[PDB]
Each structure stands twice: as C-alpha cells, then as structure tokens.
C-alpha cells in the first residue's frame, strides 16, 4: 500500500515562518556566515511529500518469523502498569500543543477539571470504539541546518487528550519492554560514557572485527501496517491491565497503523498508512522494527557473531569478519534481505575495519588523553549542525535549546568545551541567567536544566576525565578547524581568550558559578585548579535519563510541582 495518499490540500503553517538566521551581534560573535544557516519551513513540504510517498512491497520469511518469536518470548517476561490520569498529566511538557477541545498543556499539568474530564472521555472512547480512525495534524517541522537545502520533515500527531491517553496505556510498556526484548543492543539504556564503553568493548571482543552502519531511506514511510501489528503483538505479550490491553488494541488500529491527516487550517490533507512521527510508540516501535528486520537480515546474510546497537531507525552492526570479499558479499546479502523486509537503504552500507570510521547516531568514537596521559575514548560528531543551531538559538528564543543538550551529551569534545561552553556561559553570565532553567532534550524526552548544574551532570555522564582531556586526535582537530572556517566561526585561539575571561568572572562569583569556572574551564589555563569528585554528582537523581527513547512522544521528565 502507499505510505501516503494526498487530497491536494496544502501542508500549512500556523504562523509566519522564519527561514533565515537573523543578523544579530550575539549570534555573529559565534558564526559570521549567517547566510549559510537556514531553517526549514512549510514552503518545502511538497518536496518532502514526494520523497516520503511510495508503495511498499514487503515479503517476510522464516528468519523474520524466527526472530519475532524470540523477541516475543522475551517480551512475555514483562509486567506493565497502567498510569493514572495524574501520572500521565505530569509527563506532559508545559509547552505541548494545546487541545482543540478547549484546554492546553498548562491545564493538563494543573489537573484542571475541563482537561481531566476530556482526557477521561477520550480514554472511555478508546475502550469502547475499536475502529474509528483518530484525527491527526500534519505540520512541516522547523529545523536549522548549514547549507550543503533539505526540505522540511513532516510531523504527524494526534490531539493532546489522545496523547495523555497514550501515556496511560503505554508509557510503562515503551519504557521497559525495549530493554527486556533487545538487551544490550537497545541503545537508549546507555549514558554517553556507557555507549562509548559498549562500542569499544564490543569492537575489541571480536577476533577480527568488521562493522557497518545501515541507513534506511525514509524509515517511517517504510513501516508497514503489518509491521505495526507485529509491534502490537510484542506489546500484547506483556501482563497488562484489561483496559490497557483494549487501549493498545484500539490505538493500534485507530492511530498507529494509519489514519487521516488534517492540516493546520482544518482541511483534510490525506491519509497515512505508515509510522506517524508524533506518537508515543514511535521510538520503541521503530527500534523494535529495525532490530527485528536487521537481526533476521543478519541471519539471511550469514554474518557471523553480530552485535547490534539500535536507537530508532539508527543501526550499527559489529561482527566477526570472514574476509574482505566474504564481508562485501554478506553485506550485499544483508541489504537484499532488509529491502525484502521493506527497509531499503539510503546510502548503500560499507564494511569498516576501524572503529573510529563507523558512525552511529551521527557520532564516532575518538581518543584523547587525560591529565595523566592515559587514553580516554569518547563520542564526537561533526560540529556543523550543533554550531548552526546554537547560532539560531542565540538570536532567537526557541522551545528546545539544542546547545544545552549538545554540551550535556558531547561534554568531552573539543568543540563543546572550547566553543559552546564558552559562548553560552559568557552570554548567560552577562545576563545574570546562569541559574535560569532551560529546556533541552535527552533521548527525546524534555528536561529543565540550570546551566550552573552542568559540572555534576557532566561528571556523572562522562567521568571527571571530561574536564581534563587534551591531545585530541589530529583528525578531530582538523574536522573542527575546517568547520570553523566554513561557517565563519572565530578560531580556537579567540575561544581560549573568551574562555579565560568568563572563567575569571565565574570564579569571582563564588558558589556554583565558581565550580563551573573550576571544572568547565580548567582547560583554558596552565595553572590548573584541583578537580575532585563533586559532592552534588553523587546525589543527582538521573533515574529516567538513560532508560528509553521518546522522540516524538511528548514526554517531559522533570519534576512536577506540588499543588
């Protein structure tokens, strides 16, 4: 069936859309080539629509059925809880899209009578009606990139009341089931230092390793109605409350497998028969689907001793080499199997024999040295998109601060330390906002984080070595320096000067600012301050941070205030 059908009504914006980086002194201090930075808008939606619309022709085989049964046997160990309306309301981000039924996210969080009554009505309707398709809105996503243009991605999501119901039925399932089923291959269970450790140990565990990333083209569009029912069959192996079982059954047929698309103006836009990006099961469902197809495809291809790492549609496989020619042929066979399963490739995969040459979640393992000169592995990435987005976030207030998520996840990197920490600490210190909580996203869930708490967060996620790395690889330094020239970002020497300046000011303030000056900017001086474990680090409650993925799932993981 066709992934989408369209009526001809346009994908419309709900307000004016900005596509150009503003010319602003603060952003210009970071990046001078403002014309290279753009944001996608609804104006390119038609180009995306063409790319994502195609027929799927899936063929399943014994390897696929075998792997599915293995996955279901592990899912059969799970007991999932139904969340109460209160619990589910507390997981709603404060800025989540309002309902068309007369209330918004703040009303949901406050347990307002109108919100709760409506949510209860939507729940009862899921229990009673197993068929009526649930409406969804389709919008063009606004994302920032550097030129060399990408057309906007399309997001599809149901009303706020439905989203709260999805949490009640499935939040515990999508939080617990993926690890139970996929074990160590489930990527979202790892903090950054744990992900590096898994990749390095997996690589070194092979006698003669070979690895590869597999890029599926337009993954969400490749997901079939069969795939979404197979995913449901895995969820149904959990012990579930009867109302949760019915809600899952109803949501599967009424929302997850497909449904009508309405634009921002209320016009009937088309019909979807593939994965919606903006529902609670997207991350878990995609991960399970990718894992199932790939695990089966590895068997078809006769790849030996595979170990996969999967996060949504992002897949990396590390196996035992059978020799160069044998590996090349096996990878072609793997791709052929994936294609039969409706997961055709974007870039054809290539075998790699160096761990550093593999890219997963757009990141690669690199090496630096700590204060003692000992090797430390850490994950880095090309900093182009992070810097372009940081520039946009400097000129405009945005709902998610990618820069803060990037400092958290990429803290050990040369570019996050020299450029992102320096730039934002400088501006926030001047504005007396070092302690103002900002929203950021980690594995798709939203968190409200005060930049002054960064040192202890970094220590937990990466280790104290994140504050001492030096002697970065020549390859990594070259990629950063090349990026800076391309984007017109000032050279590293300028960043060192700015860092010494903000470091002095932070130290002068005492308190949490001084801990930031000491730990975050020790790299900027020769006269190192002593770094010890931060007392606050051991008390940090990071429960919930690296448990599961929730991208598109409308999840907020910070604490709800008492009423």
UniProtKB/Swiss-Prot annotation:
Coiled coil: none annotated. It catalyses: RNA(n) + a ribonucleoside 5'-triphosphate = RNA(n+1) + diphosphate. Binds 2 magnesium ion that constitute a dinuclear catalytic metal center. Residues 209-327 form the RdRp catalytic domain. Activity is up-regulated by PRK2/PKN2-mediated phosphorylation. Its cofactor is Mg(2+). It is found in: Host cytoplasm; Host endoplasmic reticulum membrane. The modification Phosphoserine is found at residues 29, 42. It is a single-pass type IV membrane protein. The N-terminus is phosphorylated by host PRK2/PKN2. It comes from the Viruses. Mg(2+) 2 binds at residues 215, 313-314. Homooligomer. Interacts with non-structural protein 5A. Interacts with host VAPB. Interacts with host PRK2/PKN2. Interacts with host HNRNPA1 and SEPT6; these interactions facilitate viral replication. Part of the replication complex composed of NS2, NS3, NS4A, NS4B, NS5A and the RNA-directed RNA polymerase. RNA-dependent RNA polymerase that performs primer-template recognition and RNA synthesis during viral replication. Initiates RNA transcription/replication at a flavin adenine dinucleotide (FAD), resulting in a 5'- FAD cap on viral RNAs. In this way, recognition of viral 5' RNA by host pattern recognition receptors can be bypassed, thereby evading activation of antiviral pathways. This is RNA-directed RNA polymerase. It comes from Hepatitis C virus genotype 1b (strain HC-J4) (HCV). The chain holds residues 2420 to 2987 of 3010 of the full protein.
